[PDB]
A paper describes a structure:
Unlike BGZP-C, BGO does not prevent recruitment of TGFBR2 to TGF-βs, thus to understand the potentiation mechanism, we wanted to gain structural information on how the BG:TGF-β complex engages with the signaling receptors. We therefore sought to stabilize the TGF-β dimer in a single conformation and prepared an alternative complex replacing TGF-β3 with TGF-β1 inTGF-β1:zfBGO:(TGFBR2)2. Cryo-EM analysis of both complexes yielded density that closely accommodated the component structures and enabled domain placement without ambiguity. Despite this, it was difficult to build molecular models due to strong preferential alignment of the particles. The positioning of zfBGO on TGF-β is responsible for the 1:1 stoichiometry as a significant clash between OD1 from both protomers would occur with a 2:1 stoichiometry. To confirm the direct potentiation mechanism, we conducted an SPR potentiation assay using both zfBGO and ratBGO. It was surprising to discover that in contrast to ratBGO, zfBGO, which we used for X-ray crystallography, did not potentiate the binding of TGF-β2 to TGFBR2. ratBGO and zfBGO share 55.4% sequence identity, with no obvious difference that we could identify to explain the observed effect. From the structure it was apparent that the most pronounced difference lay within the TGF-β binding loop of OD1, where there is a two-residue insertion in ratBGO compared to zfBGO that allows the BL in ratBGO to make additional contacts with TGFBR2. The two amino acid deletion occurring in zfBG completely impairs the direct, yet not indirect, potentiation of TGFBR2 binding and is also present in most other boney fish families.
Residue numbers in the entry:
A (entry chain C): 31 to 359
B (entry chain B), D (entry chain A): 1 to 112
C (entry chain E): 45 to 153
E (entry chain D): 47 to 153
């Protein structure tokens, strides 16, 4: 088992997931204004995968922690470098509330349930690229902005609609400002080293994930998300796999398995949580908190001593907080 | 089953999550996270009689021993089962970062 | 220290307390220093038009604003006045957590 | 990690495993058991200090809450970690059979 | 609640013509089928004292004997003459029939 870079087709894919914004500000002074304005200054990323297809960006709207139901009209100045389809996947928002989406030319607004589309409105306007110029335009056409957010291009954007009392009544773009209410989620591959000792077994499999740091500057326990879904297609599979999760620091492993069936064995030195989807779809044995050895070879030998051999695959990701597990047909 | 909704819609003295406001600076003394300055972590509390969600038969054994021998002081305890990670935003150097501090929001309480 | 100091890390901004015996940074950002070795550092500049206060995490070994730091181990941010031309310059360094938050230009009296 | 021998040989006031004998008939009422008539069923007990072998981050958070808030009525509890199966042999009809009552004897304890 | 019954095979009991004694059967077993009732048979004789206890369906006779006393919750010994030695047959359906053995209400 020579430590070599993990290939794209490897059943274990290591990604780092982070919620961040390029910049932004928030203001509670729009309470007087009957309409609230939110700005999402998307910025095109360095990725070359967006060349011809028109990028379609979803949206996740939720009431702020201090609000349960939101009814006030919400204007969204969704300026973007290029036309985008705004799939407004609202949530916990009262229907029938007008939602004016000021978008660049060619951008469309789509709603999961037609009630929102019938009540909402879409106005196409030309807006400045500059953050300050866009904020000035928003002030000129509305006299105030509830919040502004410059985010890098992403597929989803979680927004907590509502005026947070903590933030002042004035909005000033500050590069050091970041809040939960306005975040953009990003995921990128991370380097890893591993090997494959045994091929895909339809009886029981052993995939080992080693983690050094969760990419956290603090010294506390954070969540490590491991996805388990079929490698190809959406056909549910009946398979048994063994997960040896190694964390040098404290990290709680949250395993989410979708469209997979069978018995799963998890052995790790850290607490493990399983989503209800994994619980109902698969039978996961209750892990015993053991002081597992350190190092790839030591853990491999320890597993071989427990009869969970041969190892289907081993992989180690120094820096990451997200894992995807794919089952070969 | 014994989630937040079950014990918040109706008051049950048995093992379940009860409301608790955790404050970093005051209650917890943590000041290394800018915000959330405070959140909710509903903590597990309440005893479980013999007729309860006792997954491990040892818990049933302890319950029976206590019932037949009340002066034992050896009974199952209320423990979190599944805990939801908490998002947090904090600055390292001049760089803000959002992390998920796992297993600090308690939703499901079992007995063991 | 294994755990880096938790220092108030607001950059240059206007201030209300001038040469006060004891003052508070009034900084809403309490950041973990990038490295444990660096400690909280506070600088206070006074000109003929405005006064600026800057709180950061800085290495005491490396001089800041052309000034070596010798009060790195001070439990409290002890303020020393410097010979910055024209403007009045004060600077303190401290290894305690959020220690730069409280500023003492002259604890005397 | 805290084996029975560690707390039996040396008394530790922290969360540990304490001796307790349980007999099937008088205590649990398992009158259908042939042998053994009883056994030693140690139970997990002991206050949990902050500086100790803790696994769950929620337990650490609650311990810190207690430290900074002594009156909280909510602290991590000492509960079983590893439970040993009990080998028993009895008769079904007129046929001997040996079974393993899983998780019957305590071997480790944890703060959670 | 668990049901305790005497399931010892043909053994020897030290209580002969006694009002009542202990189950004198340390062996306990769970009946193969739930509907089985527990039958105790006593054949005390001058040559030797022999008793047995088993569990079986009331419908199926034991040792070519009809068990019409299975409806009794508690083991009550009905006396029937048999060549060689007297026969005392009891059947119980209630739980915990090993608490005591009763041969006759009158002393």
């Amino acid at each position: 088992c020579e430590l070599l870079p993990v290939g794209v087709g490897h059943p274990v894919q290591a990604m780092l997931k982070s919620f961040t914004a390029l910049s932004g500000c928030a203001s509670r002074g729009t309470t007087s204004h009957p309409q609230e304005v939110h700005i999402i200054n998307l910025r095109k990323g360095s990725a070359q995968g967006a060349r011809e297809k028109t990028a379609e960006v979803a949206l996740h709207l939720r009431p702020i922690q201090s609000l349960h139901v939101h009814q006030k009209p919400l204007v969204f100045i969704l300026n973007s470098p290029q036309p985008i389809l705004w799939k407004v996947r609202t949530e916990k928002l009262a229907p029938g509330v007008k939602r004016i989406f000021h978008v660049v030319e060619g951008s469309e607004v789509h709603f999961e349930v037609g009630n929102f589309s019938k009540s909402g409105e879409v106005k196409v306007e030309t807006l400045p690229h500059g953050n300050e110029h866009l904020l000035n335009w928003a002030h000129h056409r509305y006299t105030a902005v509830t919040s502004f957010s410059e985010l890098r291009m992403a597929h989803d954007i979680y927004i907590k609609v509502g005026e947070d009392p903590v933030f002042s009544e004035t909005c000033k773009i500050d590069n050091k400002f970041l809040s939960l209410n306005y975040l953009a989620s990003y995921i990128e591959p991370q380097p890893s080293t591993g090997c494959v000792l045994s091929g895909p077994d339809h009886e029981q499999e052993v995939h080992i994930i080693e983690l050094q740091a969760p990419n956290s500057s603090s010294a506390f326990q954070v969540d490590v998300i491991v996805d388990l879904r079929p490698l190809d297609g959406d056909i549910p599979l009946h398979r048994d796999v063994v997960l040896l999760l190694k964390g040098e620091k404290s990290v709680n492993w949250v395993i989410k398995a979708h469209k997979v069936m069978g018995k799963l064995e998890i052995m790790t030195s850290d607490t493990v949580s399983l989503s209800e989807d994994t619980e109902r779809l698969m039978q996961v044995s209750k892990t015993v908190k053991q002081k597992l050895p350190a190092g790839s070879q030591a853990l491999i030998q320890w597993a071989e001593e427990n009869g969970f051999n041969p190892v289907t695959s081993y992989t180690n990701t120094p820096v990451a907080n997200h894992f995807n597990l794919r089952l070969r047909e | 089953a014994l989630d937040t909704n079950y014990c918040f819609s109706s008051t049950e003295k048995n093992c379940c999550v009860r409301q608790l406001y955790i404050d970093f600076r005051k209650d917890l003394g943590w000041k290394w996270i800018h915000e959330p300055k405070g959140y909710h972590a509903n903590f597990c509390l309440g005893p479980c009689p013999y007729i309860w969600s006792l997954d491990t038969q040892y818990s049933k054994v302890l319950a029976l021993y206590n019932q037949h021998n009340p002066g034992a002081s050896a009974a199952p305890c209320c423990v979190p089962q599944a805990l939801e990670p908490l998002p947090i935003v904090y600055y390292v150097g001049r760089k803000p970062k959002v992390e998920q501090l796992s297993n600090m929001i308690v939703r499901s309480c079992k007995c063991s | 220290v294994k755990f880096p100091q938790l220092c108030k890390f607001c950059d240059v901004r206007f201030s209300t307390c001038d040469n006060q015996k004891s003052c508070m940074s009034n900084c809403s950002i309490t950041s973990i220093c990038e490295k444990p070795q660096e400690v909280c550092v506070a600088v206070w500049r006074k000109n003929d038009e405005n006064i600026t206060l800057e709180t950061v995490c800085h290495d005491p070994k490396l001089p800041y604003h052309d000034f070596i730091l010798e009060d790195a181990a001070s439990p409290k941010c002890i303020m020393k006045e410097k010979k910055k031309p024209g403007e009045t310059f004060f600077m303190c360094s401290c290894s305690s957590d959020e220690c730069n938050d409280n500023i003492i230009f002259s604890e005397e009296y």
